[PDB]
Amino acid sequence: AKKRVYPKKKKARIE
Amino acid sequence: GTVNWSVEDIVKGINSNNLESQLQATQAARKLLSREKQPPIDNIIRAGLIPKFVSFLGKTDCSPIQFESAWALTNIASGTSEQTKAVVDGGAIPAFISLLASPHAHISEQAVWALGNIAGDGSAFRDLVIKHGAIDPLLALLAVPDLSTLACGYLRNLTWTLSNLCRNKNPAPPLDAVEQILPTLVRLLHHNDPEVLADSCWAISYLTDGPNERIEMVVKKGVVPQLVKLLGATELPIVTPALRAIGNIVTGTDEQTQKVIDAGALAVFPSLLTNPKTNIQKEATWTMSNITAGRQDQIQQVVNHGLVPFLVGVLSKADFKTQKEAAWAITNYTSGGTVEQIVYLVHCGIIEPLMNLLSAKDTKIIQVILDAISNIFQAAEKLGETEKLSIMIEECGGLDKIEALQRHENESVYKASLNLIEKYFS
């Protein structure tokens, strides 16, 4: 009964 | 007109006292940095052009050069930490925060993008952007009656930059900054654009990943029902961050987990625990394990929703990480469950697959399996059916594996299986 414990971080504008 | 320029030509045009030549050179630099294959970011930085672009950002009398310099600096800051630091060292943060109030939407959007890159570099630059006072103008850009009147890409970029301002820990964002930003994230989370919804869910998952104070901050705003709704969404880009946020929330106190349960999240787990995406199955099993580690009424809620059979199935066949999360869930169940609940779990057919995973080559999962076995045997001793479970574990071929593990490298599993074999099979 014990408790425990992705998108782009940077983006370039490209054409 | 400005395609395939050389860095030498760009520097020559920037060093001229002609604003129009400077604009042409800046445009050429932007185009050169807007190629997918190997943008010469390092060459541009070495030429010492970042200060010039930062100075151009402030030429309100010439908005074209403002936009071009903003684009170039955005692309530069989108690279390594060294390049983002190069952009920041030129004083670009205050310039971009000033341009956030530009009368041209396509320039304020580029400022938002650049600040988002800078903040996304890490918690240091994030806190620095917050210190220069970006949250106020960023949120002012969203102070509209209906969010649908804004450009789709504009709103998407704003949401992404806000999410970046919410992300990263060690340290987490400033508590007062999170309090300032949360209402706008609630509003965006009720928006209808799928990409904006995904970014908002990611921001919420960022904010919910930490001490229970942050989880409480988020839950007090009443977004858990909307998070469950998005958990039921059809688009995986939206379901993933919503499930991450729900998992983070359930890692907190039993009262926050109960708030999550009341929203109806469990009713969505029949499909999440069988979702085609292995990552979704793993995340959902992790959430279920964190839920089974709570009070007994919550375990009974899990039972009533018919999720014990789904946990059995996940433990029987799934990616090994999902199976480990399921083993953790079963161990928490047996540790905090009611004798009747352990009986029901065993009746659902968990013993055979739980011994099947005893052949795993990971010491931690074997320890968890044996800890759950100890819990179940204690329940059986209480109920007086220890011999029944002994015969069960011996019939499915698991006690063979326990005898084998009796001579295991790790001492914890060694002692656990030894105690089991000596106290139940002698």
Author numbering:
A (entry chain B): 120 to 124, 148 to 157
B (entry chain A): 72 to 497
Sentences from the paper on this structure:
In the classical nuclear import pathway, the cellular transport protein importin-α (IMPα), binds to a cluster of basic residues within a cargo protein known as the NLS. The Cap gene of AAV encodes three capsid proteins that share a C-terminal sequence and combine to form the shell-like outer structure of the virus. Studies have identified four basic regions (BR) in the AAV VP1 sequence. We recently reported that an AAV porcine strain (Po1) contained a region of the N-terminal capsid domain that is able to act as an NLS.
Here we used a similar method to gather further data and structural evidence to determine IMPα2 binding in the context of a larger portion of the AAV Po1 VP1 containing residues that span the positions of all three N-terminal BRs. Rebuilding and refinement allowed for the structure to be resolved to a resolution of 2.6 Å and refined to a Rwork/Rfree of 0.21/0.24 via iterative cycles of modelling and refinement through COOT and Phenix programs. The finalized model consisted of 426 residues of IMPα2 (72–497), 15 residues of AAV Po1 Cap-BR (residues 120–124; 148–157), and 25 water molecules. The AAV Po1 Cap-BR was observed to bind within the interaction sites typical of IMPα and NLS complexes, with both the major site of IMPα (ARM 2–4, P1–P5 sites), and minor site (ARM 6–8, P1’–P3’; sites) involved in binding interactions. A high-resolution structure demonstrates that BR1 (QAKKRVL125) interacts with IMPα at the minor cargo binding site, and the BR2-like NLS region (PKKKKAR155) we previously identified occupies the major site. Lys152 is the predominant binding determinate of the major binding site by interacting with the crucial P2 site and forming hydrogen bonds with IMPα2 Gly150, Thr155, and Asp192, with a classical salt bridge formed between Asp192 of IMPα2 and AAV Po1 Cap-BR Lys152. In the minor cargo binding region of IMPα2, the expected canonical ‘KR’ motif of the AAV Po1 VP1 BR1 site can be resolved, indicating that the VP1 capsid protein indeed interacts with the host IMPα via a bipartite NLS. With Lys122 interacting with Gly323, Thr328, and Asp325 with an additional salt bridge formed with Asp325, this forms the P1′ binding site. Arg123 occupies the P2′ site with a hydrogen bond formed with Asn361, and a hydrogen bond and salt bridge connecting to Glu396.
